[PDB]
A paper describes a structure:
Nonhomologous end-joining ([name]) is one of the major DNA double-strand break (DSB) repair pathways. Mycobacterial LigD comprises three distinct enzymatic domains: DNA ligase, phosphoesterase (PE), and a polymerase (PolDom). PE and PolDom of LigD remodel incompatible DNA termini for ligation. Archaeo-prokaryotic (AP) [name] polymerases (PolDom or LigD Pol) are members of the archaeo-eukaryotic primase (AEP) superfamily (Aravind and Koonin, 2001; Weller and Doherty, 2001; Iyer et al., 2005; Bartlett et al., 2013).
To understand the molecular basis for the proposed in trans templated polymerization extensions, PolDom was crystallized in complex with dsDNA containing a self-complementary 3′ overhang. The DNA substrate consisted of a template (T) strand (ten bases) annealed to a recessed downstream (D) strand (5 bases), resulting in a 5 bp 3′ overhang on the T strand. The complex consists of two PolDom monomers (residues 10–293), each bound to a DNA “end” forming two PolDom-DNA binary complexes. The binary complexes are brought together by a continuous molecular cradle, formed by the polymerases, that promotes synapsis between the discontinuous DNA termini. The 3′-overhanging template strands are further stabilized by a region of microhomology, formed by four Watson-Crick base pairs (G7-C10). PolDom interacts with the recessed 5′ phosphate of the downstream strand, noted previously (Brissett et al., 2007, 2011) and splays the templating strand at the ds/ss junction by ∼119°. The templating strand from one binary complex appears to terminate in the active site of the opposing PolDom monomer. This configuration effectively makes the outgoing “templating” strand from one binary complex an incoming “primer” strand for the other monomer and exemplifies the term in trans for this complex. For this transition to occur, the highly conserved loop 2 (residues 213–224), particularly residues Met215, Lys217, and Arg220 make direct contacts with the incoming 3′ strand and channel it toward the neighboring polymerase active site. Lys235 and Asp227 directly contact the primer terminus, and Gln230, Ser229, and Asp137 also form part of this hydroxyl recognition pocket.
Numbering used by the authors:
A (entry chain B): 10 to 292
B (entry chain A): 10 to 88, 89A, 90 to 293
The structure:
DNA sequence: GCCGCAGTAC
DNA sequence: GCCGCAGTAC
């Protein structure tokens, strides 16, 4: 119900002196605007128990010693079943904080309660996600040009798109689906989009991961809309040198030549001032 | 040089009762027709020492115990360094046979001696491969039809194409590049073909891997043209229930609604009649 | 002290 | 008898 934060004031990002208490407050701070974008969704963690200079690990399976109040659901998986935790409460974030789970990864679908059994099973996709990964020697304007064009192609079928600077290198774009659709269809559509863009912008865009083909291109990754993939949640910290955030931005911001990744402190100032840019993303 | 056959007449394919001796003879049998298409290339092995009902493993790195007379070359693999065997003699396939390396996998480029060095490093692609992979529910007619469409596109840019039934489920197509192109360009080229094909045959053809999109469609895999990938060598045996083979075929055969995979004995007698159907492919 | 703690493709 | 025996992505 509450999480007892141990190892407080212990540094996680050595380069900025960011403490485990700093993390706790951050997630408490962005709890309001972050929750609606991850509730209902299985939450993949990446964990740096011993700081950002120390070995990390990905974790999907939830520990059987993990708190009993954490909402949970399982997914039949190739090799075995996986029981995921759903983070859906300021209390859930506090756990993320103490678990040292700097990053929170979710897919673009939620669980749905079954008719008779009421079982929590994987539901349709409620939003699309695109991952724009600037390759060898790609500058901000080209990356933004590409991002605007993706927005254009989605605008062309009456959809709206929201820019999220991942805190890493990639720009993530999300589009809410007012009528949800299977993961497969959502992947058909993100793929059509990618491909179409790659057609119209051969020298500036690739729709494929093939690394040899990336130099000088923005890889428009449409595949993470796969039912079985994951994307770093908005408002989530990263595990890098500095403590940067998958921070929601405005389209005007992208027109900035010197545009940069946003820090946790900056994100907070901007929430209190304006609120959730992604508010319309999960009504 | 020399290779002692071990545990001859021990079974590897239980379903057919195929022994190491058979495997030994088979590779001996296809030596002449197979070598040209793997010589110069790093050989990845999939080995089933305890036959085809028991765990296998992918092997790339060459054991220190391996015969000194075997050809070698090293590729830098970012995580570390691998030095593969190159198969280039009848006695090399004897060793393969002996290793129980049922399958041989090569990429579409050969090694080339560096000027001052003589150090064998990876050179450009000498042939394009398409891997036509049938998704759930895809029947014979469709695999064949899509192959014929690829051939068409390829002939539309001055290239010929040879069909090989993979020994499994897939159908592979090779194209000579009498003038070698970087793996980067071969991949670019392959991807364009596949995307053009998919654009024109959306209901029947996909160009991406995504499993959830694969069903009912032929995945024209254009991406085994990367230099860091591998495709089963032609004439190679299969780690399958029955000892099927990556067998070169004729376009006419691909008209047959009951086209199936061929087994090694069928391949053998087929060579005797025709010789190598892929001769055009690796004129060195 | 350890160790494991993901997925699923080619 | 047990073990390893692949590399590369998202």
């Amino acid at each position: 119900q509450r999480v007892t934060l141990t190892n407080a004031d212990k540094v996680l990002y050595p380069a900025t002196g960011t403490t485990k208490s700093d993390i706790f407050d951050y997630y408490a701070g962005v709890a309001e605007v972050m929750l609606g974008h991850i509730a209902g969704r299985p939450a993949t963690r990446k964990r740096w128990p011993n700081g950002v200079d120390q070995p990390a690990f990905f974790e999907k399976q939830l520990a059987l010693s993990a708190p009993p109040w954490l909402s949970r659901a399982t997914v039949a998986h190739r090799s075995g079943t996986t029981t995921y935790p759903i983070i859906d409460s300021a209390t859930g974030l506090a756990w993320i904080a103490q678990q040292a789970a700097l990053e929170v990864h979710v897919p673009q679908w939620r669980f749905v309660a079954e008719p008779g059994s009421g079982e929590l099973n994987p539901g349709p996709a409620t939003r699309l996600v695109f991952d724009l990964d600037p390759g060898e020697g790609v500058m901000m304007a080209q990356l933004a040009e590409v991002a605007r064009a993706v927005r254009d192609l989605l605008a062309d079928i009456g959809l709206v798109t929201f820019p999220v600077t991942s805190g890493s290198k990639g720009l993530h774009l999300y589009t809410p689906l007012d009528e949800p659709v299977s993961s497969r269809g959502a992947t058909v559509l993100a793929k059509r989009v990618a491909q179409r863009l790659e057609q119209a912008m051969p020298a500036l865009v690739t729709s494929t991961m093939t690394k040899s083909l990336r130099a000088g291109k923005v890889f428009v990754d449409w595949s993470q809309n796969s039912g079985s993939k994951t994307t770093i949640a908005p408002y989530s910290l990263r595990g890098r040198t500095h403590p940067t955030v998958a921070a929601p931005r405005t389209w005007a911001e992208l027109d900035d030549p010197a545009l940069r990744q946003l820090s946790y402190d900056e994100v907070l100032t901007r929430i209190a001032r304006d609120g959730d840019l992604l508010e319309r993303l999960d009504a």
